[PDB]
Design a protein around this ligand. Structure first.
Ligand SMILES: NC(=O)c1cccc2c1O/C(=C\c1ccc(OCCN3CCOCC3)cc1)C2=O
Ligand SMILES: [Zn+2]
Ligand SMILES: [Zn+2]
Lengths: 222, 456
DNA sequence: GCCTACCGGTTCGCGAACCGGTAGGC
DNA sequence: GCCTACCGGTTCGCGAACCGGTAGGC
């Protein structure tokens, strides 16, 4: 959908379009989506984050233009936001929300790499299956949904198509199929969901849940 | 089908088939939201895979020799199911999420004006250009004959869209039919998204496309065939295929003056964009059209009326006569349902020739259409069954050719008077329409060739 | 009756190699 | 769309070693 794309390298394999060296794994990298000559589909032209700003591209507002911006770590978002460039109650709720937005961002990130330290992929796969959740393709995406599951709740099936809703940037988009020919287009900020049930098998669940986690709903950007 | 020349082994090894089922399928997949609009041709020559975005250089292919012939079936049926979702054999097909859907592939002794008539109506490259504006795939549609059952389903999808549009159905409902249609009939939009079929005239535009597309494949069906023996001439072979007796009415003829009067007189005051000019008059006589019309020579109120259509259609109109729209097709565009439409004014009919400043010449018909006891209507109304004792329908217009100057012609009433006000003015039509709901009621008399003079 | 140097054959341990399913790349 | 580097899971290959049967010596 978007022209640009930012994420942490899913593998230290892809090369950089400008300098032509291997972009290392788990490193901040940016892309520009182009039409592939070989097949009918868009393809990312990956750049080193350092090399991205010398090609001449100038993203005015990263949060609205670049994809995967909200999924990044809070401090890394500010690096993109700054590098892109180179009343009492109103400002209070405005400032205090950004405090709670950071609070939510690095809460999930603390929870994400906590599971990466303790649990293998097969544990995280069977975590989602136990909660009646669709297991996604990808390592990063699996713990992203497990962390989403634990903090907010196990997502109930869709109203019409009975598919799986997924958090994407600014809302929960339905990824199911209203029919064989077309994909479902349900979208919401307040989806339906029961409470996340961890199985008995968790000797470090008391450590992860002890990280000051109370009941709260997903907060979104302005 | 034959071998795809993208392999490079087209005139070397034949495409294989196991008894009945031919090991060759051309798949398609479109998602209007994503914008994807792709093809996927699979063949078993060696196995050959072709893929890309329909109507563009985007894509690639892979020719690959097999270890053996039984491994070919293994590789073919596996690739097939992986891409399409279903098995190679099935009772009825079922589409699957993000999987593909298979598309169902199947010295001349005559006058100079008559030779030009065949020259005009059998030039198929002119018919190809005609489809370019519709955005039909130009690449492999001439060699790749799209199935009859396929086009009927494509018609059905269009009729479902109009039904969905009429009663303001869901966007998803519309999204599906728009997806379904462009999958079933491959379009060429280039690098931009397929547009949603949400309008009332968009379905009509795509309905007209199918009507024209059909007649081109019919024009091919005539052209491709016969008995290629060294005796007759090339133009004569195509003349005999038309299955009609065409003659040239001389300009000195007294009946020719009547037609030129009928052209000159019945030009519309509102249609002042162009000016007609009769190049030729052809007297036309179809094979057995008098045998089927005999019944309606008993019928009263017979009128010699105009009927225009694309130069591409006249290849089929001569061979099969004037035909009513199929039952699967949508009723959109028609004023009073599916049937043969006629007009008393040459101009109103002449608009259906679809001529431009670049393409000046155009063909228009004159048929002895047995109207009989007429059912007169003012406003538009989609009728299914006619009222009792009525053999035709009439759309009452504001302007009508002078009824006190209606000249006769071989026992046929020719209304070649100039325009005056009608009896009733509570209508939503400016000019008259004459509708027959039976192909037997029409009998084509004259075919004209008209030059259009615009001002640009 | 002992002891023991020598030999054929089974087991055991561990890294190389193999492999099918797949997430990432273009 | 297809290609392929990566992952875990099992197998495979081969030398050390373990072990029992034995025949030349005293
Ligand atoms: N074309 C005419 O001679 C004509 C003249 C005056 C009025 C109308 C005409 O046509 C109307 C509508 C119309 C025209 C063509 C058409 O074609 C449907 C497909 N057929 C094309 C010919 O071969 C059979 C199939 C459908 C509606 C009209 O309302
Ligand atoms: Zn670089
Ligand atoms: Zn849904």
């Amino acid at each position: 959908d978007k022209l640009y794309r930012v994420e942490y390298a899913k593998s230290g394999r892809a090369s950089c379009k400008k300098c032509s060296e291997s972009i290392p794994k788990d490193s901040l990298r940016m892309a520009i989506m182009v039409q592939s000559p070989m097949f009918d589909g868009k393809v990312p032209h990956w750049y080193h984050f350092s090399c991205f700003w010398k090609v001449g591209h100038s993203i005015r507002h990263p949060d609205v233009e670049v994809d995967g911006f909200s999924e990044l770590r809070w401090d890394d978002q500010q690096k993109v936001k700054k590098t892109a460039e180179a009343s009492k109650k109103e400002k209070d709720k405005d400032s205090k929300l950004e405090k709670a937005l950071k609070a939510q961002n690095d809460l999930i990130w603390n929870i994400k790499d906590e599971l990466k330290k303790v649990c293998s992929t097969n544990d995280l796969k069977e975590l989602l299956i136990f909660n009646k959740q669709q297991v996604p393709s990808g390592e990063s995406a699996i713990l992203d949904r497990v962390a989403d599951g634990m903090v907010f709740g196990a997502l109930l099936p869709c109203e019409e198509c009975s598919g799986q809703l997924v958090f994407k940037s600014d809302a929960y988009y339905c990824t199911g199929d209203v029919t064989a020919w077309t994909k479902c287009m349900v979208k919401t900020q307040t989806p339906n969901r029961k409470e996340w049930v961890t199985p008995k098998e968790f000797r470090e669940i008391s450590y992860l849940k002890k990280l000051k986690v109370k009941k709260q709903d997903r907060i979104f950007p302005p | 089908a034959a071998v795809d020349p993208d392999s490079g082994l087209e005139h070397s090894a034949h495409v294989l088939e196991k008894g009945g089922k031919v090991f060759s399928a051309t798949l398609g997949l479109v998602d209007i939201v994503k914008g994807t609009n792709s093809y996927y041709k699979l063949q078993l020559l060696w196995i050959f895979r072709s893929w890309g975005r329909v109507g563009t250089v985007i894509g690639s292919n892979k020719l690959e020799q097999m270890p053996s012939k039984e491994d070919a079936i293994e590789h073919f049926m596996k690739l097939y199911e992986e891409k399409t979702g279903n098995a190679w054999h099935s009772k009825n097909f079922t589409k699957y999420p993000k999987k593909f859907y298979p598309l169902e592939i199947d010295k001349s002794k005559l006058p100079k004006p008559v030779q030009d008539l065949i020259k005009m109506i059998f030039d198929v490259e002119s018919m190809k250009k005609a489809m370019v504006e519709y955005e039909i795939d130009l690449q492999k549609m001439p060699l790749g004959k799209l199935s009859k059952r396929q086009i009927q389903a494509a018609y059905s999808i269009l009729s479902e869209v109009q039904q969905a549009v009429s009663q303001g159905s869901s966007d998803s409902q519309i999204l599906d039919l728009s997806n379904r249609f462009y999958t079933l009939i491959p379009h060429d939009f280039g690098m931009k998204k397929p547009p949603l079929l949400n309008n009332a005239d968009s379905v009509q535009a795509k309905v007209e496309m199918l009507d024209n597309l059909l007649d081109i494949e019919v024009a091919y069906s005539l052209l491709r065939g016969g008995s290629d023996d060294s005796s007759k001439d090339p133009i004569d072979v195509n003349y005999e295929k038309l299955k009609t007796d065409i003659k040239v009415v001389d300009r000195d003829s007294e009946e020719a003056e009547i037609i030129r009067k009928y052209v000159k007189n019945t030009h519309a005051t509102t249609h002042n964009a162009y000016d007609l000019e009769v190049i030729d008059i052809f007297k036309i006589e179809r094979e057995g059209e008098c045998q089927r019309y005999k019944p309606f020579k008993q019928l009263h109120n017979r009128r010699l009326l105009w009927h225009g259509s694309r130069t591409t259609n006249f290849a089929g109109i001569l061979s099969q006569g004037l035909r009513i729209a199929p039952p699967e097709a949508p009723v959109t565009g028609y004023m009073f349902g599916k049937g043969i439409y006629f007009a008393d004014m040459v101009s109103k009919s002449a608009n259906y020739c679809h001529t431009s400043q670049g393409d000046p010449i155009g063909l228009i018909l004159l048929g002895e259409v047995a109207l009989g006891n007429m059912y007169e209507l003012k406003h538009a109304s989609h009728i299914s069954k006619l009222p009792k004792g009525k053999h035709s329908v009439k759309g009452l217009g504001k302007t009508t050719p002078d009824p006190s100057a209606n000249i006769s012609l071989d026992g046929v009433d020719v209304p070649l008077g100039t325009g005056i006000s009608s009896g009733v003015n509570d209508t939503s039509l400016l000019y008259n329409e004459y509708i027959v709901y039976d192909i037997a009621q029409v009998n084509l008399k004259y075919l004209l060739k008209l030059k259009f003079n615009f001002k640009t």
